[model samples]
Target: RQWAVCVYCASGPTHPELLELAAEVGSSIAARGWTLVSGGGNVSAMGAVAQAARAKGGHTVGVIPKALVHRELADVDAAELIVTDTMRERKREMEHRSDAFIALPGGIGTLEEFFEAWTAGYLGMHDKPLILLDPFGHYDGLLTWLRGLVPTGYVSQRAMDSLVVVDNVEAALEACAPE
Candidate 1:
């Protein structure tokens, strides 16, 4: 398949459940013969996803800033490891090279990336789908907070609705795949 599914998830050390979920997500992407675009970190959730996909014979492309190459243990096993100069550049590369985006539970980095993609979609920059994988309700608070913004006219309903939130990886994949 020519589809590239960009996965934005935690690169830092995380819980085992999240790592297992990431592995499941990677395996699913590989099962569909889709390429995995990641942050290029070979640690914790990010590495787990990439390794799982690779083990299943899936193509994985990773991108990270040059400064973070060692910091994040930049993945050398990836099919293509793109090293950029800045975090902004890395995010732009991920956003531009993928057909769809899936955001997993992460810290500030993940949120920033997720919001940037959502913002781009909201402004008509890209029509691609944005999926949120919240298997453990990791985003309950955040989603509710965003929901509160709806009535204040601070957030567009369409923009909020554009983000597909699912409780499972399979459902998230089903939401973004072309029919």
Candidate 2:
């Protein structure tokens, strides 16, 4: 079966290269016959991925908070758009709809989404891959902080293994595929 993948991205607009990368990743997922799940947004990297996926005739699903729909944030061209009443509800909808998750360079909201999925896997709420697409080493500091937590007994080595960090989208997608 084709993988069902959720992509979490930063809010607001970004550089041309990042946008290109998001589109490329979307196309790749489509080309591989995978289902793409993401935040229903029309700005920033979130918009780029959803747009590219739809353009390539991919199966793309978006989950957005109903509060943001009129805010003009939801992606309009998604194959499926699910609007929930709350942010928590939106997150749960995305998680339950995906088989794997990937985080692109993002802001606080993106981090929150990534952490929730990671923690869910850690706590045995789900058994699926969580990948970090660390473009330009943006997440290096956070990864280091996580490593630092190891010696303090806050986390174990195996716990860190749950997250596969890579420098590009191809690696991220490969990590998401069935082993």
Candidate 3:
């Protein structure tokens, strides 16, 4: 019943609103006594998430490449900061450390992370829940396109049904239970 919740969010030239939302998600995760796991980001939405979590006395793990770790954007208060050799290894380490994955509004980088995590689950590599916190409908176009693919035999039923999509962050956290 423990939660190591991996959060995939924007590393951005961010909108202030998105950063606040990311913080809200982080605070919620910590409020529920779950660990926040993320790519080591000390700027933008990613940093906001970890910042809020740590402020709430939550545990956090940040996985970053060695090059990025050397940058000023590394989380100084992260409970565990893992430095990996490559971007691929960073994702692998993040997956191994987490029991759930949640995606907040973000750019291409966030989409790429979401794709990998969702694909792994769709392919039966993991059983962790895949969530899209889309309260603002930032992902509506993408979700619509994915749904369209299902009717064309391009997407399997199970693949489309595998996602645990929610409009609220609270529901997202509620879905993180291990069993």
Candidate 4:
């Protein structure tokens, strides 16, 4: 079976260095013979990852909401684009299609998507790996908060361990290794 890694990130403009790191991660994922999946937006980190994966001869699947199409957010070059009726449906589609997930530095939307997947794993719905691509230490505060959750009895240590924090592309790919 083909392994697919879903990358979650901001749909708006992103930092150049973060975008470059995301592109490299995409290339690494492709080089490992894995498929790349994203929100299907042609801007920001989502577009950067998909574009780099495609450049390295990797297949890409983009799940987007129809409403976003009018906003010109869809990635036209994605090998497979699944247009859904709502953002919720789009997220569900991406979750259903992916074998693993990576959260790149992004706004609230990215956090929302990553948390949902993480929650699913926490609830024993799936065993897919959840990763945070912490380029330039962008997710440091969030990681601290997550660890704090354990002490506050809000999140279990086991659940917290489900999320892998990595600083680079190679480590991210290594985290995607078969369970």
Task: Report each candidate's C-alpha RMSD, comma-separated, in the order given.
Answer: 1.0, 1.4, 1.5, 1.2
Between candidates 1 and 4, name the one with more favorable TM-score.
1
lDDT of candidate 4 over 44-121, digit per residue (tens): 888899999999999999999999985747898999999999999999999999988999898888889988999999
Cα distance off (Å), candidate 4, residue 131: 0.7
Question: Candidate 3's residue-wise lDDT over 37-63, tens digit each?
Answer: 988779788899999999999998999
Clashing pairs in 4: none
Cα lDDT of model 1 by residue, 14-128, tens digit: 7988999999999999889999999999988899999999999999999999999998999999999999999999999998889899999999989999999999998999999
Colliding residue pairs in candidate 3: none
Q: What are the runs in model 3 whose C-alpha is more than 4 Å off?
A: 70-72
Candidates ranked by lDDT? 1, 3, 4, 2
Error of 2 at 120 (Å): 0.7
TM-score for each predicted model, relative to the true structure: 0.97, 0.94, 0.94, 0.95
Each candidate: what lDDT? 0.92, 0.87, 0.88, 0.88
lDDT winner, 1 or 2: 1
Q: Which residue runs does candidate 1 get wrong by more than 4 Å?
A: none
| Model 2 CA deviation exceeding 4 Å by range | none
Return model 3's CA RMSD, one decimal. Answer: 1.5
Candidate 2 lDDT, 116-159, residue by residue in tens: 99888999999989999877778889999999999899998888
